[PDB]
Structure 1
Amino acid sequence: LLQDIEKRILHYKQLFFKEQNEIANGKRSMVPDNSIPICSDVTKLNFQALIDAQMRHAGKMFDVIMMDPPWQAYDSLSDEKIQNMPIQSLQQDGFIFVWAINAKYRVTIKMIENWGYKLVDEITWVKKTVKIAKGHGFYLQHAKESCLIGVKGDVDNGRFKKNIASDVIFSERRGQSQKPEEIYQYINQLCPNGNYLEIFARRNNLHDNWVSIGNEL
Structure 2
Amino acid sequence: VTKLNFQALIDAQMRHAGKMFDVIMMDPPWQAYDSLSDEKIQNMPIQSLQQDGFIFVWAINAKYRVTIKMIENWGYKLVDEITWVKKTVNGKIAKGHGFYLQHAKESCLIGVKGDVDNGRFKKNIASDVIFSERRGQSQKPEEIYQYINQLCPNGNYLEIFARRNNLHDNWVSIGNEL
User: TM-score range with shorter-chain normalisation?
Assistant: over 0.9
Work out whether residues 196 and 210 of structure 1, in 8 Å CA contact, stay in contact via their aligned partners in 2: yes
Q: What are the superposed Cα offsets for residues 32-59 of structure 1, whole Å, 9 maximum, x if unpaired? A: xxxxxxxxxx221111110010000100
Please report how far the alpha carbon of residue 73 of structure 1 lies from its aligned counterpart in structure 2 after TM superposition: 9.2
Larger Rg, first or second structure (1 or 2): 1
CA distance in 1, matches of 2:161, 2:23: 14
What does the per-residue CA deviation read over 1:104-154, in whole Å, with 9 as the maximum and x for residues that have no partner?
A: 100000000000111100000111112321231122111101100100011
How far is the alpha carbon of 1:215 from its aligned partner? Answer: 1.1
Task: State the partner residue of 1:95.
Answer: 54
Rounded to whole Å, the distance in 2 between the matches of 1:170 and 1:162 is 21
- Poorly superposed stretches of 4+, deviation over 2 Å: none
Distance, in Å, in 2 between the alignment partners of 1:53 and 1:195 is 13
Contact 1:129/1:172, CA 8 A, preserved across alignment:
yes
Q: TM-score, normalised by structure 2?
A: 0.95
The residue number in structure 2 matching 1:124 is 83
1:204 Cα deviation from its structure 2 partner? 1.3
Instruction: Give the counterpart of 1:81 among 40, 43, 52.
Output: 40
Q: Deviations over 1:147-191 (max 9, x none)?
A: 001000111011111112111011121112111111100001111
Contact 1:73 1:200 in 2 (8 A): no
Residue among 47, 68, 71 paired with 1:112:
71
- Give the CA deviation at 1:211: 0.4
Q: Identity of counterpart residues, as a percentage?
A: 100
> What count of residue pairs does the alignment treat as equivalent?
176
Secondary structure of the residue aligned to 1:161 is coil
Aligned-partner Cα distance in 1 for 2:30–2:47: 20
Q: Do the aligned partners of 2:29 and 2:36 also contact (CA within 8 Å) in 1?
A: yes
Whether the 8 Å contact between 1:127 and 1:170 is mirrored in structure 2 is yes
Instruction: Determine the C-alpha separation between the residues in 2 that align with 1:127 and 1:96.
Output: 23
Counterparts in 2 of 1:163 and 1:102: CA distance versus 1, 3 Å: same
Root-mean-square deviation over aligned CA pairs: 1.1
Q: Secondary structure at the match of 1:66?
A: strand
Whether the 8 Å CA contact 1:125–1:145 is kept in 2: the answer is yes
User: Counterpart of 2:25 in 1: which secondary structure?
Assistant: coil
Gaps of 5+ in 2: none
> Residues 88 and 134 of structure 2 are in contact (CA less than 8 Å); yes or no, is this contact kept in structure 1?
no
The equivalent residue for 1:45 is 4
CA contact (8 A) 1:71 1:78 kept: yes
Q: Tell me, in whole angstroms, the C-alpha distance in 2 between the residues paired with 1:211 and 1:44.
A: 19
Q: Greater helix share, 1 or 2?
A: 1
Residues 23-80 of structure 1 show CA distances to partners (whole Å, capped at 9, x for unaligned) of xxxxxxxxxxxxxxxxxxx221111110010000100100000110000192121110
C-alpha distance 73-169 of structure 1, shift in aligned 2 (>3 A):
farther
Which protein, 1 or 2, shows the higher relative CO under an 8 Å CA cutoff with sep ≥ 6? 1
**Alignment partner of 1:197 out of 155, 158, 171:** 158
How far the C-alpha of 1:89 sits from its partner, in A, is 0.3
